[PDB]
Design a protein around this nucleic acid. Structure first.
Ligand SMILES: [Mg+2]
Ligand SMILES: [Mg+2]
Ligand SMILES: [Mg+2]
Ligand SMILES: [Mg+2]
Ligand SMILES: [Mg+2]
Ligand SMILES: [Mg+2]
Ligand SMILES: [Mg+2]
Ligand SMILES: [Mg+2]
Ligand SMILES: [Mg+2]
Ligand SMILES: [Mg+2]
Ligand SMILES: [Mg+2]
Ligand SMILES: [Mg+2]
Ligand SMILES: [Mg+2]
Ligand SMILES: [Mg+2]
Ligand SMILES: [Mg+2]
Ligand SMILES: [Mg+2]
Ligand SMILES: [Mg+2]
Ligand SMILES: [Mg+2]
Ligand SMILES: [Mg+2]
Ligand SMILES: [Mg+2]
Ligand SMILES: [Mg+2]
Ligand SMILES: [Mg+2]
Ligand SMILES: [Mg+2]
Ligand SMILES: [Mg+2]
Ligand SMILES: [Mg+2]
Ligand SMILES: [Mg+2]
Lengths: 168, 213, 175, 159
RNA sequence: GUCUACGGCCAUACCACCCUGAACGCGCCCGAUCUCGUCUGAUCUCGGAAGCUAAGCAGGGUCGGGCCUGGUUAGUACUUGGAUGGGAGACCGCCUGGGAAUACCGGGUGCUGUAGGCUU
RNA sequence: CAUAGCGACGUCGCUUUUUGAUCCUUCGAUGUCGGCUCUUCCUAUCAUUGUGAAGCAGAAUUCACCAAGCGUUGGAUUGUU
RNA sequence: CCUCCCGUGGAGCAGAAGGGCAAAAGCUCGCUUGAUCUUGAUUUUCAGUACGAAUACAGACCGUGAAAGCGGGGCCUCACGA
RNA sequence: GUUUUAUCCGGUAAAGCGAAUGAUUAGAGGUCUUGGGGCCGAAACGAUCUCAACCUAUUCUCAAACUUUAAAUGGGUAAGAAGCCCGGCUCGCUGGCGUGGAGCCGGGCGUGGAAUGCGAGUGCCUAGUGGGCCACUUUUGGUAAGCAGAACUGGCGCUGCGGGAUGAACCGAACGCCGGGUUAAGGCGCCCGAUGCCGACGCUCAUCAGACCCCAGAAAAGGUGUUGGUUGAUAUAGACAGCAGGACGGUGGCCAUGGAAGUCGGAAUCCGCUAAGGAGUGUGUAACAACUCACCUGCCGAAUCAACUAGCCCUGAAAAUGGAU
């Protein structure tokens, strides 16, 4: 049996709103930069991040995005945090002026750094404004329960790509 | 003068034993817990039948007394007075209290309502859990239906839901009936009274050589 | 656990190697699940019940769908299961006729829900086995063991009741 | 309605562990406490003098003052919505050194050694400790053995 | 391989009984003039060196008790977070993580620092 | 002769025609007991209609069912209910 | 009453209870007055105000013991007043 | 108001009582005594039989004010430049010592020594408030309460909007004025937007059916209604059910007696004929007698029976103006 490497990149989408949230869940969502429903963020997976995801498990749906999902997310909804402003990534110079010191100078470099979690993944990911995704076209199953019990919350392994396709 | 058992059915309070803090407790209704031929040896009564609660609730001492009397009468009628041994496995250690109100047409007569409402000891009940044995009857292997009927009749004296289970243990021991015979044969078990003493293979060899002799 | 059309998954897992055993044993189960995520979750549930394993302390080395090896052949399935009723746990042996094992298990889940109000989280499928027609015990399954089976369709209810919604002719049920 | 006694609720907090009563072992007195080092306040009950209050049991502070028998400890205490650095005098029976600080200083010394050695030998080495990474890909051999098939057991009432 | 003095951890070191102990040592032992305490030189203090390892002490033994450490109990009990799950309720099941304790069955029975002796 | 008719020890309920418990509404006020008068409603049926049962021979009585259509009174004492 | 043996405290420590304690903190003797004179800091309640109580020091003058030391009241948690 | 990695802290849940402290059930084995005593022992209970107390090894059941053991959640600290490492100086403190400690002065080290996120620090003046209430869970008093009192978080108060017909608190979601798209929770016969799908599989008939969190009504106990399931049993050596026979002798067995003869009661359950028969499951006779059963056989020729269990339905199930999925 060949056991593949455990995935090192996750996409996290906040699926519940901002009403009646416990303080710990609220704090962890703020640290994940998910302050609004249907906001998405790339998360580098390790013990600390996974335990944070476990804390905010009922409020999020997360999974392992593929190359196509990363491309669609960066190209259609990719916005940079340039001078604390949400600027659309309409030119490569916008990426180069903020991340060129790390070697990232284009959309392709940004996508590569996000997909293959590189040395400067933290800088490249924080440069991206959190993705403001639409409502899931076709609806959800049940946002109040876990994915493995017929709902939408929690870790769906690679069905996050289906969710993304319906989501943006 | 006793309240209906529905007022004390549930395990709502913390356990309240009769101790040096709770004084003035009236004696429990049930004082005898073992009936029938209690002196019967272990091999005499190989069959054991338990009655097991399915609810986490409180059984009153009066209810335990009534169930014990009913089961005893049926067992004496069916299997004879020396053909069975019964053991009640619940002891009413939890004191239930009453905040007594005056049953007269007056609240001005120092009723005080809910002021100083901590009650006086009303009675004693036994706390039972799901899966806990309430009564056990050991007898001959041919009286299985009589044991089941006696426990079925005793079930009607209790509030909740109870199951009748024929145990795999030999009598009142904790050892399986299939292994009991060869364990006694190889002297891992030594009978005494209604129970067996387990003899482990450790300790002084003098205890080993008093056996096998 | 919800449902759909269930699929069979062969799920093989093990503990993570530790400085007590470098090669821990591999364990395999058949899990009937809507998808592989639920299949892995149920695998961890069952191996946690049986062995002393956890998802964090172990790993899953394989999870692959088991295709039916003869989906063109009607066959009899006996299913041993256990479930929690409202007042206890019971073991059941049920029988179904189907082409696929996963379809038979789906039939079992629907039938348990219909006859015993048993939700899928209460049901533990512990054995599924194709059985010979002479080993069947349920008459509703045995009555289809006829080489000359023959029956009509007596009272055929109109299902196109709204195309048309209004008409002059009353429908016929005999065909 | 609660009393304000100094030792209310300390019935088990200040009691000795099982079969550990009697004479206080002397290594506790033989420990050396300098200013600035990190100590854990425990508060054994055999010695009634210099006892810390129950709110400092289990806390950790920094030594700022050393006397003949006690130390002065700056320990954080949370009061309503503020944390203030209280200064307490605690006899050395009720304190012990902090192995967290000990391990951190060991790690600093070892990192400085690695920096010196790696600058001597050229090759760059990692010093920042990382969280547990995702497991890498690997092969699991069956060794010609079919993995055991597991099935849930039938239900039966035991006891 | 051991002992003595002073110890650190304070039963893997304790408790009961039995066996063995070469050489130093530690003791038991002899005595009350002096020092010093007593109802009593029993204890304490002092001055000794005839005898003895009988005892303490050291080592070993016991299908020994205890203690220490494992397995089982048991992924059980319990439990963080979740559901417009079930049930009249009592309560229970599932998802997400954590996870015990008896009984029962094994193994072990002090380690060591400083200073000074004995052991061909 | 347990169960025609009853039902100890226990135990499960219902009702709001008792009395309590509480203090949610009312203190810029909801006139506070009983009787009289008058209408309507409930059934957990006293009688009457139709029935079943008896330790129902008849007579009388008792238990139970469908059942509130109809009726359920005149007085001494007491403010009384 | 006298003697031996076992005795982890199952006694005692003023009192309520809890904690603590064995060549102890208990019992009996001997000598004593640290239950004395002072300044600050700190803990407890706390608003980080006071009182009360307490802890660690520092400066005197002492007590005790061969000495190390210990003692500025009571083994600790209460026993009090602008 | 976060995790991770180290490192401490705790005594709740659980568990335990063949571990201490309390509570507590039942037997068993021993041998002393102001235990009762014990039948023939006074005579040296010549004896040893029982019951006590006591001890020993077990055994049932417990604890908010018990505990060996002991979670989950939780609380503190640390994760560097105020650090590390070299030298040197000061001290009236400490002292065998160039001792220890503290301070001070120079110098060299940047891989900025976990993850994630965020711009921080600091001062002055200051209103209103100081009746709260509700929900999940934990929890005290109380029979309980839309009762009284606490812990945690969220909410209402201060908040509109979609859904729960209706509703301060439930579920979804929080709000500038609009257009388009899509959803949440909830829904899609008609009211009323949307299943006018040739939706799937079953269950259920109610002469009080049932119909969706909070929530707005029900239990124990029953059913040969029906549907699944568990365990056991019988059967071509012919089951089951029907129809038809035998159902005895001793013995009208013993002790009960005024009759109890098999059946008003106490013990025991024999034998043989065999096809079987209980010296009796019931009716009953004053009593006999006469019947019935369990037991066997005949006719009948293929499957049948029993005890449980849990789904829907039914009984249990009664209130007042006429009425509420
Ligand atoms: Mg909400
Ligand atoms: Mg659409
Ligand atoms: Mg919710
Ligand atoms: Mg009543
Ligand atoms: Mg209570
Ligand atoms: Mg041993
Ligand atoms: Mg769990
Ligand atoms: Mg009678
Ligand atoms: Mg008016
Ligand atoms: Mg009016
Ligand atoms: Mg009626
Ligand atoms: Mg002084
Ligand atoms: Mg003192
Ligand atoms: Mg406590
Ligand atoms: Mg407990
Ligand atoms: Mg105990
Ligand atoms: Mg309240
Ligand atoms: Mg207001
Ligand atoms: Mg607000
Ligand atoms: Mg609102
Ligand atoms: Mg609305
Ligand atoms: Mg409604
Ligand atoms: Mg719109
Ligand atoms: Mg609607
Ligand atoms: Mg419409
Ligand atoms: Mg009904």
């Amino acid at each position: 049996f060949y056991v593949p490497a455990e995935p090192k990149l996750a996409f996290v989408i906040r699926i519940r709103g901002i009403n009646g949230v416990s303080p710990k869940v609220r704090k962890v969502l703020q640290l994940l930069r998910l302050r609004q429903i249907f906001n998405g963020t790339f998360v580098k997976l390790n013990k600390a991040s996974i335990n944070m995801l476990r804390i905010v498990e009922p409020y999020i749906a997360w999974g392992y995005p593929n190359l196509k999902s990363v491309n669609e997310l960066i190209y259609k909804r990719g916005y940079g945090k340039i001078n604390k402003k949400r600027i659309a990534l309409t030119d490569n110079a916008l990426i180069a002026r903020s991340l060129g010191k790390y070697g990232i100078i284009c959309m392709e470099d940004l996508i590569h750094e996000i997909y293959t979690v590189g040395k400067r993944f933290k800088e490249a990911n924080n440069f991206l404004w959190p993705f403001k995704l639409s409502s899931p076209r076709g609806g959800m199953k049940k946002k109040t329960t876990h994915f493995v019990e017929g709902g939408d919350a929690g870790n769906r392994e690679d069905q996050i790509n289906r969710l993304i396709r319906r989501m943006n | 003068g006793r309240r209906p058992a529905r007022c004390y059915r549930y395990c709502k309070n913390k356990p309240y034993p009769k101790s040096r803090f709770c004084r003035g407790v009236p004696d429990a209704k049930i004082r005898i817990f073992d009936l029938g031929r209690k002196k019967a040896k272990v091999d005499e009564f190989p069959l054991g039948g338990h009655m097991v609660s399915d609810e986490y609730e409180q059984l009153s001492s009066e209810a335990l007394e009534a169930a014990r009397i009913c089961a005893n009468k049926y067992m004496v009628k069916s299997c004879g007075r020396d053909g069975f041994h019964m053991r009640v496995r619940l002891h009413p250690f939890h004191v239930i209290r009453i905040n007594k109100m005056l049953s007269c047409a007056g609240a001005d007569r120092l009723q005080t309502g809910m002021r100083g409402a901590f009650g006086k000891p009303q009675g004693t009940v036994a706390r039972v859990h799901i899966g806990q044995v309430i009564m056990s009857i050991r007898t001959k292997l041919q009286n299985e239906e009589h044991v089941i009927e006696a426990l079925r009749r005793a079930k009607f004296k209790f509030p909740g839901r109870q199951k009748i289970h024929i145990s795999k243990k030999w009598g009142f021991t904790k050892f399986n009936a299939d292994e009991f015979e060869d364990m006694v044969a190889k002297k891992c078990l030594i009978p005494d009274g209604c129970g067996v003493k387990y003899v482990p293979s450790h300790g002084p060899l003098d205890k080993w050589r008093v056996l096998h002799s | 656990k919800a449902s759909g059309t269930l699929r069979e998954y062969k799920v093989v897992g093990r503990c993570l190697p530790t400085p007590k055993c470098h090669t821990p044993p591999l364990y395999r189960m058949r899990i009937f699940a809507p998808n592989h995520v639920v299949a892995k979750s149920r695998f961890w549930y069952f191996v946690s019940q049986l062995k002393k394993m956890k998802k964090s302390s172990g790993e899953i080395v394989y999870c692959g769908q088991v295709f039916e090896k003869s989906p063109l052949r009607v066959k009899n399935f006996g299913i041993w299961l256990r479930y929690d009723s409202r007042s206890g746990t019971h073991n059941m042996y049920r029988e179904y006729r189907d082409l696929t094992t996963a379809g038979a298990v789906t039939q079992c889940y629907r039938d348990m829900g219909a006859r015993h109000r048993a939700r899928a989280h209460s049901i533990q499928i512990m054995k599924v086995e194709e059985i010979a027609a002479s080993k069947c015990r349920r008459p509703a399954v045995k009555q289809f063991h006829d080489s000359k089976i023959k029956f009509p369709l007596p009272h055929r209810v109109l299902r196109r009741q709204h195309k048309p919604r209004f008409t002059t002719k009353r429908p016929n049920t005999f065909f | 309605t609660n009393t304000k006694g100094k030792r209310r609720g300390t019935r088990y907090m200040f009691s000795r562990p099982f079969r550990k009563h009697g004479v206080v072992p002397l290594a506790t007195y033989m420990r050396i406490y300098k200013k600035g080092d990190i100590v854990d306040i425990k508060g054994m009950g055999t010695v009634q003098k210099g006892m810390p209050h129950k709110c400092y049991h289990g806390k950790t502070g920094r030594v700022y003052n050393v006397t003949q028998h006690a130390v002065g400890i700056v320990v954080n205490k949370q009061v309503k919505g503020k944390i203030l650095a209280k200064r307490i005098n605690v006899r050395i029976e009720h304190i012990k050194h902090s192995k967290s600080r000990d391990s951190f200083l060991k790690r600093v010394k070892e990192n400085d050694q690695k920096k010196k050695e790696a600058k001597e030998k050229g090759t760059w080495v990692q010093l920042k400790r990382q969280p547990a990474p995702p497991r890498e890909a690997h092969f699991v051999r069956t060794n010609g053995k079919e993995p055991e098939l597991l099935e849930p057991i039938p239900y039966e009432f035991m006891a």
